[PDB]
Amino acid sequence: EPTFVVNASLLPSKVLGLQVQRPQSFNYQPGDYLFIKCPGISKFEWHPFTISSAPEMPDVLTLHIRAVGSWTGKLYQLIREQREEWIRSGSSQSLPGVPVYIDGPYGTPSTHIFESKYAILICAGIGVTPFASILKSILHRNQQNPAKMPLKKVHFYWLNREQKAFEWFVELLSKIEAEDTNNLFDLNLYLTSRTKTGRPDWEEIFKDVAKQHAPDNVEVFFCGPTGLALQLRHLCTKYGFGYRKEN
């Protein structure tokens, strides 16, 4: 339970990459989320974040936080000010750590992606934190033993309207396309890396992946709004795929 924040990242758009000492009892799956208490902001509140580090990562957890309101802004400050006083001051013995409490892990149906043969992962919006975790572990599982893993093709389609806070995620995807030696991944990005503008024609993306994998079964993992959820379930049923909604 009791731990510390062992680094930060002042990532664009006020986003806060974080490094959290992973307790020896703390073993999580990909996409799992956390409840965190930082006493120096609130002695009382807990707040929830998805872990953005595959559980293959050894002895840290990375949390990409966005300052969007009180505790997250107060959080950002206790960092920039905690960091900016090691630059115009720089008393460099070693860095200290921000004591924080953590509660979890709490699960997601994501663990089923690793069990399925083909797979459509769709993030509409900004719930992309768990998908960064997932897509890393897929990398590691593919490397360490790609025969051991049923997941043979991952189709990733991402819809955001603006990526300023998410320039960290874009990089990470490019990395995945790099070490993706086996062409396990089909990453697509759409704006609402030369990526695609406008709404995707889902009728065709599903019609295409279908042909890619006949007569095998495909599983959809949707993570977005409900009016998109409905369109896809009708496509799932029209090509006989397999649907579930995360969050």
Ligand X SMILES: Cc1cc2nc3c(=O)[nH]c(=O)nc-3n(C[C@H](O)[C@H](O)[C@H](O)COP(=O)(O)OP(=O)(O)OC[C@H]3O[C@@H](n4cnc5c(N)ncnc54)[C@H](O)[C@@H]3O)c2cc1C
Ligand Y SMILES: O=C(c1ccccn1)N1CCN(C(=O)c2c3c(nc4ccccc24)/C(=C/c2ccco2)CCC3)CC1
Does 9 participate in binding ligand X (rule CB under 6 A)? Answer: no
Binding residues: 47-48, 50, 64, 66, 70-72, 127, 129, 161, 192, 224
Closest CA to 128 of 6, 247, 3, 9: 247
- Least distance from ligand X to the Cβ atom of residue 34, Å: 8
Does 168 participate in binding ligand X (rule CB under 6 A)? Answer: no
Does 107 participate in binding ligand X (rule CB under 6 A)? Answer: no
In contact, 103 and 20? CB cutoff 8 Å: no
d(CA 136, CA 140): 6
d(CA 38, CA 56): 25
**Per-residue string for binding with ligand Y, 127-146, x by CB under 6 A?**
x-xx----------------
Q: Which of 49, 118, 166, 185 binds ligand X (CB under 6 A)?
A: 49
Q: Which of 60, 95, 126, 170 binds ligand Y (CB under 6 A)?
A: 126
Part in contact with ligand X (CB under 6 A); list of ranges 48-56, 76-84, 173-181, 226-234: 48-56
Does 10 participate in binding ligand Y (rule CB under 6 A)? Answer: no
- Least distance from ligand X to the Cβ atom of residue 136, Å: 15
Length of the chain: 247
- The conformational region for residue 131 under phi > 0 = left, psi -120 to 50 = alpha, else beta, is alpha
Phi, psi of 161 (to 5 degrees): -90, -25
